[PDB]
Amino acid sequence: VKSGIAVGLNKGKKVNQLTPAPKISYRKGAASQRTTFVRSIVKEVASLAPYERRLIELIRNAGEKRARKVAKKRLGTFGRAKAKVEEMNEIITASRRH
Amino acid sequence: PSHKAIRRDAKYNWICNPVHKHREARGLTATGKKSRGINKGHKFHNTQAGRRKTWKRQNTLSLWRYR
Amino acid sequence: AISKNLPILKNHFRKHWQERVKVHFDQAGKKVSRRHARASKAAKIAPRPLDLLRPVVRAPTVKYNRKVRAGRGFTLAEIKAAGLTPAYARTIGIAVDHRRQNRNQEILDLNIQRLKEYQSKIIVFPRKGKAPEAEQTLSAAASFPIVQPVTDSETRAVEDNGESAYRTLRLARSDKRYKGIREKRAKDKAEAEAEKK
Amino acid sequence: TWRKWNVKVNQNEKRYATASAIAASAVPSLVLARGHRVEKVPSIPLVVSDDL
RNA sequence: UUGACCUCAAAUCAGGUAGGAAUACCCGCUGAACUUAAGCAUAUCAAUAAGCGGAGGAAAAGAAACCAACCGGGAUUGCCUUAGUAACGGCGAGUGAAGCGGCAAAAGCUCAAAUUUGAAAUCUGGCGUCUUCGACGUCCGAGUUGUAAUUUGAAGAAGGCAACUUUGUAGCUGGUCCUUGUCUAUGUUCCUUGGAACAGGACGUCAUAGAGGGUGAGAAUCCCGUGUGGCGAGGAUCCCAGUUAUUUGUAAAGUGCUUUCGACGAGUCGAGUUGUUUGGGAAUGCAGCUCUAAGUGGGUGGUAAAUUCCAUCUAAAGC
């Protein structure tokens, strides 16, 4: 909803608005029921990478923060280190425990 | 292209035409169009339609009959 | 090199410019080629118009939002609203654009009227036998022009209420500058430190 | 080739000169001075019927 | 002992295909200096000349991992504007785009990733027969480590309920478009000058033909033509029109409602660093090297980061 003036927060002209119905191409990045099943099988076959085998050793010793700094150098950016280190904790809670 | 299975079948017929002689050399392959830098965007201005083509356009004096 | 009291010019002629000169002598002759091409195409096609029927569209930016202009294609929502399929519409002389969207009820109606006006006025010949020909109209833009929407009432009441239009702009502009820090000042004092209390 | 051949002229300036030339069609002094054997002709601003 | 399969060979085996030429324009690689800065080293000339590879009558580009911040536009290409502007630069000399706006022209689409699985449905060659740029039948081979039908994000599929509107393949004549051949007006009358009238003077004729050329000197009317319109011949043929065979059909397409799903491209994206290039400035694109992902994910939003939102498209295959 616009405010009815050229300068402001909303800005500007008021119209009968809604709606565009959603396209098919907006979904794109959404999951499964093949893909999660196939990715589950392609994990037991076979193992983790060498840099990932340091991550779980680093979590047992020096927890977080150091785990991010090692992952940030090996992977691209800080935002990708968030995803990897959060995922590696879910491996320990799932596989090693219970 | 000379083999008759490729000539008759309509899905793979286009490659037999004379315009597709040495695509690899001129850079009409997947890797070729990446190396030339042909993509839609503000990042790709100096090369997009053609690097030398664009230079040849904008380094030229266009004169009409009535100036 | 310089010196009287003249303006400092900028002439970019230090490359081999004379090798890459163009003179448009062909202007007059090239016009006849296009008039010949437009005429010869109409002879081949025969009873149909040369142009596809285009929709009405509003322009972008602050500079041009106050004017309407002929777009590219009719969208999929508007073609459905009239009562026809998108695949069928392409062979009747109606342009379709799969990527344009609708977020306005005013433009939505206008183009539905434009399609209903088009479908009524055109005739269609069957595939089989008889074909009662009715000359050719060349330009679709001539028969279906673009008119500017009128948002006007020439004589009108004078309703004042001591608000001041100038004072409204100064207050509204000040809110945009300061809502960032005013949210954060409210997130301290009243929240965080006093939600602890 | 790229020397200036054609010359642009103002639209009103052409119509000024073309209008004055149509004024020059009448008036017998300017016609005889600019050639033309027009001794026989009864008057000028010469109009003919539409059978022509 | 015999026969398969997988990789690799040989033959003047059966049948095909590649080179050179020309290069005005077009697609890439490679790459100078004279010069300008009143010197000269970054810069400039120039992402230019010479050198090398590859095409066609055009080439390239092209159906958004786009432009925007509006009440939003909507593949590519070119012209007029934007602009000598925003930026770049011993911030010196000098260099220098793009969005919107008005026009010319407008056309859209295909694979991979799903099981035909109640019938590899598909295709090359051999031999035979026909109406021979092909069609029909038959015999080996290719191929299940995947050839047909079916679907491409604008969607779409599998079920249930429901009304149905559509259809197709040859040759014959005529027009149309090219290459052409032929036909279609009027003074050579009299006198002077001259080697010669095509000159000068007198009297006519034709004109939808007084363009141009030829003939012993400036010829509409002496000759070829020119103008106006006829009449043939020989190709191209699907572009149209009008016909005649056929004979496609119980198969192919479209649409209203409702439930469950909805597969989307990796030594890539992205990060660091070196060299090169751009107007692109804590780095515009390209390339080498080291590191190396993801599933509401990834890209972009022209100042480096961390934190939280929003708007926009769907890359790493192709016409």
XYZ file of C-alpha atoms (C1' of nucleotides) in Angstrom:
733
model
C 0.000 0.000 0.000
C 1.377 3.405 -1.075
C 0.929 6.656 0.900
C -0.426 8.979 -1.861
C 2.577 11.353 -2.172
C 5.878 11.664 -4.081
C 8.098 11.744 -0.942
C 7.847 9.379 2.052
C 8.216 5.807 3.315
C 5.723 3.943 1.102
C 5.848 6.201 -2.018
C 3.545 6.918 -3.792
C 0.457 6.526 -6.029
C -2.565 4.503 -4.803
C -4.031 1.846 -7.158
C -6.258 -1.266 -7.163
C -3.365 -3.642 -6.408
C -3.644 -7.423 -6.019
C -2.626 -9.912 -7.372
C -0.077 -11.694 -9.592
C -0.468 -15.485 -9.262
C 2.846 -17.286 -8.587
C 4.919 -18.679 -11.478
C 6.258 -22.249 -11.748
C 9.935 -21.155 -11.921
C 9.885 -19.577 -8.402
C 9.795 -23.035 -6.723
C 13.097 -24.248 -8.307
C 15.088 -24.828 -5.068
C 12.730 -27.168 -3.187
C 13.350 -30.626 -2.205
C 12.236 -34.055 -2.757
C 11.087 -37.199 -2.798
C 13.459 -38.774 -5.220
C 16.243 -36.339 -4.433
C 16.296 -36.799 -0.630
C 16.037 -40.593 -1.135
C 18.921 -40.657 -3.671
C 21.103 -38.307 -1.562
C 20.488 -40.595 1.458
C 21.848 -43.597 -0.506
C 24.781 -41.530 -1.890
C 26.301 -40.958 1.582
C 26.807 -44.460 3.016
C 28.454 -44.925 -0.409
C 30.970 -43.578 0.410
C 32.578 -41.657 3.329
C 33.395 -37.952 3.922
C 36.174 -35.716 2.512
C 39.583 -35.064 4.231
C 38.693 -31.473 5.262
C 35.387 -32.736 6.744
C 37.323 -35.363 8.772
C 39.119 -32.464 10.548
C 35.838 -30.597 11.299
C 34.376 -33.275 13.639
C 37.788 -33.600 15.382
C 37.800 -29.794 15.875
C 34.252 -29.835 17.374
C 35.241 -32.507 19.950
C 38.319 -30.423 20.929
C 37.639 -26.675 20.428
C 33.858 -26.592 19.711
C 32.617 -23.720 17.509
C 34.323 -20.529 16.171
C 37.559 -22.420 15.388
C 35.312 -24.785 13.373
C 34.000 -21.770 11.402
C 37.479 -20.275 10.787
C 38.843 -23.560 9.351
C 35.718 -24.042 7.185
C 35.814 -20.405 5.948
C 39.351 -20.876 4.551
C 38.564 -24.261 2.934
C 35.117 -23.295 1.560
C 34.247 -19.979 -0.156
C 32.519 -17.518 2.192
C 31.357 -17.074 5.823
C 27.743 -17.872 4.836
C 28.804 -21.272 3.448
C 30.701 -22.043 6.693
C 27.395 -21.497 8.570
C 25.731 -24.240 6.488
C 28.608 -26.761 6.724
C 29.348 -26.450 10.474
C 25.615 -26.560 11.367
C 25.269 -29.669 9.151
C 28.335 -31.389 10.710
C 26.773 -31.097 14.201
C 23.671 -32.904 12.846
C 25.935 -35.817 11.757
C 27.303 -36.208 15.322
C 23.854 -36.073 17.000
C 22.320 -38.519 14.472
C 25.066 -41.051 13.674
C 27.363 -41.234 16.730
C 24.686 -40.909 19.450
C 21.685 -43.284 19.704
C 27.173 -35.278 -40.974
C 27.773 -37.420 -44.113
C 26.285 -40.581 -42.503
C 22.657 -41.170 -43.584
C 21.268 -41.838 -40.065
C 22.152 -38.259 -39.009
C 20.940 -36.722 -42.327
C 17.384 -38.155 -42.350
C 16.521 -37.920 -38.621
C 15.119 -34.430 -37.925
C 16.402 -34.121 -34.319
C 20.085 -34.133 -35.404
C 19.703 -32.777 -38.985
C 20.630 -29.102 -38.299
C 24.318 -30.015 -37.666
C 24.673 -31.262 -41.298
C 24.145 -27.692 -42.683
C 27.151 -25.777 -44.152
C 27.018 -22.920 -41.568
C 28.280 -25.274 -38.783
C 31.728 -25.994 -40.306
C 34.327 -25.783 -37.492
C 32.310 -24.493 -34.517
C 35.307 -25.216 -32.233
C 37.608 -22.829 -34.176
C 35.354 -19.746 -34.322
C 34.111 -20.331 -30.739
C 30.467 -21.397 -31.128
C 30.755 -24.275 -28.592
C 29.794 -24.187 -24.873
C 33.340 -23.249 -23.767
C 33.754 -20.854 -26.742
C 30.842 -18.538 -25.886
C 32.025 -18.400 -22.242
C 35.565 -17.391 -23.317
C 34.235 -14.660 -25.653
C 32.073 -13.312 -22.789
C 28.593 -13.375 -24.338
C 25.962 -13.092 -21.574
C 23.004 -10.790 -20.827
C 23.886 -8.225 -18.131
C 25.366 -4.890 -17.040
C 28.613 -6.794 -16.342
C 28.880 -7.650 -20.081
C 28.919 -4.364 -22.071
C 32.340 -4.288 -23.798
C 31.687 -7.786 -25.200
C 28.094 -9.026 -25.699
C 26.970 -8.838 -29.351
C 30.588 -8.720 -30.534
C 33.746 -7.235 -28.977
C 35.192 -5.933 -32.261
C 31.686 -5.292 -33.689
C 30.812 -2.927 -30.804
C 34.184 -1.135 -31.101
C 33.676 -0.738 -34.880
C 30.208 0.798 -34.272
C 31.028 3.396 -31.578
C 34.393 4.424 -33.136
C 32.757 5.698 -36.350
C 31.498 9.095 -37.593
C 27.925 8.825 -38.958
C 26.993 11.672 -41.349
C 23.601 12.286 -43.018
C 22.642 14.329 -46.112
C 21.173 17.113 -43.944
C 23.561 17.748 -41.027
C 47.898 25.016 -28.801
C 45.385 27.151 -26.805
C 45.064 30.892 -26.035
C 42.567 33.647 -26.768
C 39.334 33.566 -24.694
C 37.564 30.540 -26.196
C 35.750 27.561 -24.604
C 37.823 24.407 -23.968
C 36.593 21.889 -26.566
C 36.674 18.070 -26.576
C 37.271 16.660 -30.081
C 37.949 12.893 -30.117
C 39.811 12.555 -33.445
C 43.263 11.106 -32.643
C 42.551 7.602 -34.056
C 42.282 6.595 -37.737
C 38.784 8.095 -38.080
C 38.933 8.716 -41.866
C 39.109 4.952 -42.578
C 35.849 4.401 -40.618
C 33.582 7.166 -42.010
C 30.000 6.624 -43.197
C 27.963 8.995 -45.387
C 24.249 8.188 -45.780
C 23.767 8.791 -49.520
C 21.335 5.830 -49.539
C 18.621 7.597 -47.411
C 16.427 8.413 -50.446
C 16.977 5.108 -52.294
C 16.673 2.976 -49.135
C 13.240 4.526 -48.407
C 11.881 3.143 -51.718
C 13.257 -0.340 -50.871
C 11.199 -0.343 -47.637
C 8.027 0.951 -49.371
C 8.530 -1.762 -52.026
C 9.083 -4.393 -49.289
C 5.941 -3.376 -47.339
C 3.877 -3.466 -50.574
C 5.210 -6.832 -51.831
C 4.608 -8.488 -48.422
C 0.933 -7.397 -48.488
C 0.566 -8.974 -51.967
C 1.862 -12.355 -50.693
C -0.203 -12.398 -47.474
C -3.302 -10.871 -49.215
C -6.377 -10.394 -46.971
C -4.581 -10.069 -43.566
C -3.027 -6.952 -41.950
C 0.767 -6.530 -41.798
C 0.820 -5.773 -38.032
C -0.031 -7.952 -35.022
C -2.521 -6.439 -32.547
C -0.601 -5.065 -29.515
C -1.880 -4.183 -25.983
C -1.827 -0.974 -23.891
C 0.968 -0.652 -21.280
C 2.193 1.911 -18.701
C 5.831 3.111 -18.808
C 8.534 2.882 -16.063
C 10.497 5.460 -13.975
C 9.489 8.819 -12.437
C 9.992 10.629 -15.780
C 7.502 8.559 -17.871
C 4.922 7.032 -15.425
C 2.469 9.842 -16.412
C 1.975 8.386 -19.960
C 0.714 5.155 -21.598
C 2.343 3.270 -24.519
C 1.811 0.226 -26.803
C 3.380 -2.878 -25.185
C 4.681 -6.206 -26.544
C 2.154 -8.970 -25.709
C -1.172 -9.526 -23.960
C -0.204 -11.818 -20.989
C -1.812 -15.182 -20.134
C -4.331 -13.852 -17.557
C -5.978 -11.341 -19.944
C -6.191 -13.856 -22.836
C -8.018 -16.253 -20.455
C -10.360 -13.483 -19.184
C -11.744 -12.777 -22.689
C -12.312 -16.491 -23.438
C -9.636 -18.130 -25.610
C -6.427 -20.211 -25.485
C -2.858 -18.823 -25.902
C -1.881 -21.249 -28.720
C -4.977 -20.343 -30.789
C -4.437 -16.570 -30.308
C -1.028 -16.551 -32.086
C -2.603 -17.532 -35.459
C -5.408 -14.870 -35.340
C -3.020 -11.849 -35.188
C -2.766 -11.336 -31.414
C 0.659 -10.981 -29.749
C 1.325 -13.063 -26.608
C 3.986 -12.432 -23.929
C 4.498 -15.150 -21.288
C 6.649 -13.025 -18.890
C 4.597 -9.805 -18.322
C 2.509 -9.760 -15.111
C -0.590 -7.897 -13.871
C -0.659 -5.852 -10.632
C -3.276 -3.269 -11.723
C -7.066 -3.524 -12.226
C -7.139 -0.495 -14.592
C -4.759 -1.979 -17.207
C -6.439 -5.412 -16.767
C -9.852 -4.078 -17.892
C -8.570 -1.869 -20.767
C -6.885 -4.804 -22.552
C -9.912 -7.119 -22.064
C -11.988 -4.413 -23.829
C -9.260 -4.289 -26.519
C -9.524 -8.071 -27.152
C -13.360 -8.075 -27.224
C -13.295 -5.122 -29.664
C -10.762 -7.035 -31.814
C -12.607 -10.401 -31.803
C -15.919 -8.724 -32.754
C -14.572 -6.626 -35.658
C -12.394 -9.310 -37.345
C -13.857 -12.156 -39.444
C -12.408 -15.683 -39.829
C -12.429 -17.892 -42.950
C -12.792 -21.697 -42.626
C -10.168 -24.196 -43.847
C -12.414 -26.071 -46.315
C -14.218 -24.340 -49.221
C -15.813 -20.887 -49.421
C -13.841 -17.688 -48.715
C -15.862 -14.450 -49.137
C -12.997 -11.942 -49.432
C -13.280 -8.380 -48.076
C -10.225 -6.408 -49.329
C -7.333 -5.751 -46.872
C -6.844 -3.216 -44.069
C -3.075 -2.790 -43.672
C -2.436 -1.109 -40.302
C -3.936 -2.615 -37.124
C -2.722 0.486 -35.215
C -4.966 2.746 -37.359
C -8.208 0.865 -36.593
C -7.208 0.188 -32.942
C -5.436 3.360 -31.678
C -3.918 4.143 -28.251
C -5.761 6.813 -26.204
C -4.511 8.445 -22.978
C -6.687 7.651 -19.896
C -8.575 10.696 -18.543
C -8.434 11.356 -14.774
C -10.003 14.810 -15.061
C -12.908 16.851 -13.692
C -12.669 20.322 -15.276
C -14.775 22.209 -12.692
C -14.604 21.026 -9.074
C -15.087 21.966 -5.390
C -12.483 23.783 -3.259
C -12.252 21.766 -0.017
C -9.643 23.366 2.289
C -8.810 22.119 5.812
C -5.729 24.064 7.074
C -3.201 21.220 6.661
C -0.575 22.928 4.418
C 0.881 20.787 1.587
C 4.435 22.116 2.168
C 4.366 21.134 5.870
C 3.129 17.627 4.909
C 6.246 16.996 2.754
C 8.723 18.145 5.449
C 7.181 15.844 8.098
C 6.920 12.839 5.732
C 10.551 13.212 4.579
C 11.777 13.490 8.204
C 10.128 10.136 9.065
C 12.134 8.286 6.363
C 15.449 9.771 7.593
C 14.894 8.929 11.284
C 12.818 5.678 11.464
C 16.061 3.625 11.539
C 17.519 5.188 14.703
C 14.043 5.786 16.243
C 13.339 2.025 16.044
C 16.723 1.243 17.664
C 16.271 3.926 20.374
C 12.905 2.252 21.149
C 14.633 -1.180 21.129
C 16.826 0.233 23.930
C 15.338 2.274 26.858
C 11.786 0.822 26.555
C 12.967 -2.656 25.445
C 15.979 -4.840 26.401
C 16.957 -2.764 29.486
C 13.339 -2.224 30.682
C 12.013 -5.664 29.616
C 14.697 -6.959 32.031
C 12.911 -4.986 34.803
C 32.867 11.900 -50.495
C 31.974 13.342 -47.048
C 31.979 17.052 -48.079
C 28.694 18.948 -47.564
C 26.440 18.451 -50.628
C 22.868 19.205 -49.503
C 21.707 22.249 -47.510
C 18.955 22.387 -44.864
C 16.439 25.264 -45.134
C 13.656 26.450 -42.787
C 10.093 25.322 -43.613
C 8.531 28.783 -43.144
C 11.322 30.386 -45.239
C 10.497 28.140 -48.243
C 6.760 28.928 -47.975
C 7.584 32.668 -47.774
C 9.579 32.475 -51.038
C 7.079 30.142 -52.771
C 4.186 32.502 -51.877
C 6.060 35.536 -53.282
C 6.763 33.594 -56.516
C 2.994 33.031 -56.996
C 2.530 36.815 -56.540
C 5.140 37.247 -59.321
C 2.995 35.130 -61.724
C 0.671 38.148 -62.001
C 1.933 41.734 -62.653
C 2.979 42.190 -66.333
C 6.248 44.128 -65.728
C 8.097 41.182 -64.116
C 6.908 38.616 -66.720
C 8.115 40.517 -69.830
C 11.444 41.403 -68.146
C 12.006 37.661 -67.508
C 11.640 36.652 -71.189
C 8.267 35.340 -72.468
C 6.390 36.662 -75.535
C 3.239 37.910 -73.738
C 2.194 40.819 -76.006
C -0.931 39.152 -77.481
C -2.462 37.862 -74.228
C -5.635 39.615 -72.933
C -4.659 40.570 -69.340
C -2.731 38.065 -67.160
C -3.614 36.088 -63.986
C -4.685 33.765 -66.803
C -7.407 31.224 -65.933
C -8.811 28.572 -68.321
C -11.954 26.377 -68.142
C -11.957 22.799 -66.776
C -12.499 21.250 -70.256
C -8.681 21.589 -70.545
C 38.021 -79.921 -27.313
C 34.302 -76.011 -29.146
C 31.751 -71.223 -29.141
C 30.868 -66.412 -27.048
C 32.144 -61.406 -24.972
C 35.685 -56.874 -24.080
C 39.848 -53.944 -25.868
C 43.336 -53.460 -30.245
C 44.854 -54.487 -35.305
C 45.258 -55.626 -40.974
C 43.395 -55.348 -46.204
C 44.288 -51.836 -53.697
C 37.957 -55.028 -48.423
C 31.837 -52.267 -49.752
C 30.565 -46.887 -49.724
C 31.596 -42.107 -48.379
C 34.328 -37.742 -46.606
C 38.874 -33.741 -45.501
C 42.603 -30.639 -47.884
C 43.699 -25.690 -52.012
C 41.604 -20.918 -54.270
C 39.477 -15.921 -53.419
C 39.124 -12.605 -48.790
C 35.376 -6.074 -49.728
C 32.198 -7.409 -45.410
C 31.876 -11.333 -41.002
C 33.801 -15.022 -35.873
C 38.185 -15.768 -33.019
C 43.552 -15.960 -31.483
C 48.284 -13.072 -31.710
C 50.328 -8.237 -31.384
C 53.959 -3.663 -32.496
C 56.375 1.066 -33.018
C 56.542 5.963 -35.451
C 53.422 9.501 -33.078
C 51.054 12.815 -28.664
C 52.614 14.427 -23.566
C 56.525 20.658 -26.530
C 61.812 16.087 -22.588
C 60.587 10.834 -20.783
C 59.327 5.918 -17.957
C 52.605 4.859 -16.519
C 49.479 6.780 -20.281
C 48.610 7.701 -25.715
C 48.510 5.844 -30.932
C 45.430 0.747 -30.030
C 42.346 -3.719 -27.176
C 44.780 -0.637 -34.147
C 48.622 -2.375 -38.801
C 51.531 -6.839 -40.220
C 51.255 -12.535 -38.761
C 47.853 -17.362 -37.908
C 43.036 -20.360 -37.867
C 37.521 -20.604 -39.841
C 32.433 -19.271 -42.549
C 28.335 -17.390 -45.683
C 25.328 -14.493 -48.965
C 25.289 -12.419 -45.375
C 27.794 -13.573 -40.800
C 27.335 -13.024 -35.542
C 23.500 -12.475 -31.689
C 18.736 -14.373 -29.784
C 13.532 -16.255 -26.398
C 16.407 -13.264 -19.707
C 20.752 -16.863 -13.533
C 17.922 -9.206 -17.973
C 16.636 -3.914 -17.081
C 14.389 -1.450 -12.901
C 12.896 0.740 -7.663
C 7.929 3.106 -11.563
C 1.018 3.167 -11.231
C 6.855 -1.021 -13.175
C 8.981 -2.689 -18.408
C 9.656 -7.764 -21.216
C 14.340 -12.362 -26.930
C 18.108 -10.288 -30.373
C 19.718 -6.523 -34.233
C 20.153 -1.332 -36.206
C 19.021 4.354 -36.571
C 17.899 9.099 -33.753
C 18.670 10.809 -28.681
C 21.111 9.808 -23.854
C 26.663 12.467 -24.096
C 31.346 14.520 -25.243
C 27.647 13.007 -19.928
C 28.316 9.218 -15.053
C 33.220 7.369 -14.314
C 38.776 6.678 -15.788
C 43.719 9.467 -16.018
C 52.105 11.701 -13.798
C 43.161 13.659 -12.027
C 48.445 16.132 -16.880
C 47.906 15.288 -22.017
C 43.911 12.653 -23.186
C 39.923 8.756 -22.793
C 34.520 7.579 -22.232
C 29.819 3.733 -21.891
C 24.703 1.980 -20.493
C 19.119 2.122 -18.518
C 14.469 4.615 -19.753
C 12.151 7.643 -24.317
C 10.861 7.915 -30.338
C 11.302 4.738 -34.781
C 12.657 0.465 -38.695
C 11.477 -4.979 -38.213
C 9.003 -8.450 -35.201
C 8.230 -15.443 -34.579
C 9.113 -18.210 -31.660
C 11.221 -23.002 -29.512
C 14.075 -28.169 -28.451
C 16.831 -31.871 -25.261
C 18.753 -34.418 -20.304
C 16.725 -35.671 -15.646
C 10.050 -40.570 -15.256
C 9.410 -47.989 -16.785
C 6.586 -49.237 -23.747
C 8.128 -53.356 -19.680
C 1.205 -56.980 -21.382
C 5.786 -57.253 -25.654
C 12.986 -52.123 -29.191
C 7.393 -50.060 -30.561
C 13.213 -47.318 -33.467
C 17.650 -47.109 -37.448
C 22.180 -48.024 -41.092
C 23.700 -51.270 -44.982
C 22.850 -55.951 -48.324
C 19.465 -58.551 -52.005
C 14.666 -57.970 -54.926
C 10.610 -54.971 -57.194
C 8.311 -50.245 -58.416
C 5.597 -44.427 -60.260
C 13.456 -43.356 -58.218
C 16.048 -36.211 -54.559
C 11.945 -41.559 -52.914
C 8.322 -45.773 -51.587
C 7.194 -51.308 -50.389
C 8.959 -56.241 -48.808
C 12.685 -59.374 -47.042
C 18.102 -60.902 -44.605
C 22.209 -59.817 -41.547
C 23.926 -55.932 -38.187
C 23.569 -51.493 -34.642
C 21.504 -51.103 -29.777
C 19.000 -52.589 -23.197
C 26.366 -49.438 -20.363
C 19.253 -47.088 -23.654
C 17.279 -46.316 -30.137
C 11.086 -44.669 -30.651
C 6.405 -42.391 -28.623
C 5.511 -39.049 -24.042
C 7.109 -33.872 -21.077
C 10.560 -28.748 -20.767
C 9.193 -24.731 -16.044
C 5.007 -19.932 -19.881
C 4.797 -25.493 -17.165
C 3.633 -30.487 -16.757
C 2.260 -35.608 -15.270
C -0.709 -39.555 -12.852
C -5.891 -40.672 -11.122
C -11.462 -39.343 -10.646
C -15.777 -36.367 -12.331
C -17.574 -33.729 -17.146
C -19.041 -31.751 -21.974
C -17.247 -32.046 -26.774
C -15.088 -28.717 -31.120
C -11.586 -29.868 -34.804
C -9.100 -32.726 -38.581
C -5.813 -35.503 -43.225
C -1.664 -37.238 -48.636
C -0.578 -37.029 -54.490
C -0.772 -34.034 -60.613
C -3.270 -31.619 -63.758
C -4.571 -26.970 -65.742
C -4.554 -21.581 -64.862
C -2.554 -17.175 -62.578
C 2.055 -15.441 -60.102
C 7.647 -14.932 -60.232
C 12.203 -15.339 -63.517
C 15.020 -16.203 -68.426
C 13.725 -14.552 -73.125
C 12.115 -13.942 -78.889
C 8.986 -11.085 -82.163
C 5.128 -7.240 -83.763
C 2.869 -2.327 -83.218
C 3.202 6.287 -86.036
C 4.969 10.452 -89.534
C 8.695 14.281 -95.862
C 13.837 12.201 -97.877
C 8.502 17.861 -101.919
C 10.653 22.809 -104.166
C 14.792 26.978 -103.975
C 20.282 29.142 -102.370
C 25.318 27.671 -100.237
C 28.683 23.419 -100.693
C 33.130 17.831 -102.251
C 28.977 16.169 -99.183
C 22.691 18.863 -96.356
C 22.293 16.475 -91.211
C 22.799 24.233 -92.728
C 19.298 28.594 -94.248
C 14.272 29.772 -96.521
C 9.170 28.205 -98.188
C 5.090 24.467 -97.605
C 3.243 19.949 -94.762
C 2.739 15.343 -91.468
C 2.833 12.216 -86.678
C 2.972 12.930 -81.344
C 0.648 8.257 -74.464
C 6.800 8.555 -79.667
C 10.602 16.419 -79.567
C 15.291 10.267 -74.624
C 19.961 8.653 -76.885
C 22.840 6.928 -80.996
C 23.997 6.076 -86.421
C 24.545 8.019 -91.445
C 30.078 12.531 -96.278
C 28.433 19.455 -91.352
C 23.324 21.180 -85.493
C 17.876 14.861 -88.371
C 11.031 13.903 -84.032
C 9.455 13.019 -89.526
C 16.458 8.864 -93.809
C 17.979 4.021 -90.219
C 18.110 1.600 -85.440
C 15.369 2.935 -81.240
C 11.909 5.607 -77.865
C 6.323 5.620 -76.339
C 1.864 2.935 -76.093
C 0.146 -1.723 -75.882
C -0.474 -7.115 -78.056
C 1.399 -12.202 -79.256
C 4.633 -16.538 -78.552
C 8.509 -20.026 -76.381
C 11.316 -22.085 -72.283
C 12.331 -23.031 -66.973
C 10.835 -22.277 -61.274
C 7.082 -24.821 -59.244
C 3.484 -24.756 -53.528
C 2.875 -18.755 -53.243
C -2.244 -18.406 -54.318
C -6.713 -19.978 -57.015
C -9.796 -23.887 -59.095
C -10.330 -29.082 -59.709
C -9.663 -34.554 -59.595
C -7.911 -39.321 -57.380
C -7.969 -40.712 -53.040
C -8.688 -42.063 -47.577
C -7.289 -41.062 -43.722
C -10.881 -42.702 -37.670
C -12.239 -45.423 -34.008
C -6.775 -41.913 -33.552
C -4.877 -37.307 -33.199
C -5.697 -32.683 -30.916
C -7.987 -28.824 -27.652
C -10.924 -27.149 -23.006
C -14.336 -26.880 -17.172
C -13.752 -29.037 -12.065
C -10.999 -31.820 -8.035
C -6.788 -34.938 -5.290
C -1.530 -36.445 -4.999
C 3.167 -35.189 -6.834
C 6.065 -31.776 -9.642
C 12.545 -35.226 -11.570
C 15.556 -28.842 -13.603
C 22.830 -29.446 -16.141
C 29.787 -29.985 -10.534
C 36.772 -29.431 -10.770
C 30.900 -26.112 -12.036
C 28.997 -21.797 -8.978
C 31.664 -19.174 -5.246
C 36.509 -17.727 -2.706
C 41.929 -16.412 -2.747
C 46.237 -14.967 -5.992
C 49.007 -13.732 -10.486
C 49.023 -11.541 -15.519
C 45.891 -8.989 -19.082
C 41.711 -5.752 -20.475
C 37.370 -2.105 -19.494
C 34.364 4.040 -18.190
C 33.702 0.033 -14.000
C 36.457 3.180 -8.910
C 38.659 -2.422 -1.520
C 39.043 -4.862 -8.442
C 34.374 -4.919 -15.874
C 35.341 -9.452 -18.287
C 38.870 -13.329 -19.633
C 42.670 -16.927 -18.615
C 46.493 -19.952 -15.452
C 47.125 -22.070 -10.358
C 45.497 -23.555 -5.243
C 41.013 -24.277 -2.342
C 36.039 -26.269 -3.254
C 29.729 -26.104 -2.187
C 24.232 -26.087 -1.813
C 18.320 -27.321 -1.668
C 13.886 -22.392 -0.118
C 18.922 -23.468 -2.670
C 21.918 -20.329 -6.119
C 22.635 -15.473 -8.974
C 22.099 -10.024 -9.197
C 20.628 -5.140 -6.937
C 27.811 -0.464 -9.769
C 31.973 1.102 -1.822
C 35.006 -3.536 1.540
C 32.522 -6.230 5.981
C 29.027 -8.703 9.800
C 23.476 -8.779 11.108
C 18.015 -8.590 9.460
C 14.450 -7.911 5.563
C 12.517 -6.957 0.521
C 12.419 -6.943 -5.120
C 13.840 -9.782 -9.284
C 15.203 -13.632 -12.540
C 16.524 -19.828 -12.744
C 23.209 -20.368 -14.751
C 26.932 -24.530 -15.481
C 23.253 -28.372 -22.762
C 21.018 -26.771 -27.920
C 18.193 -24.528 -32.649
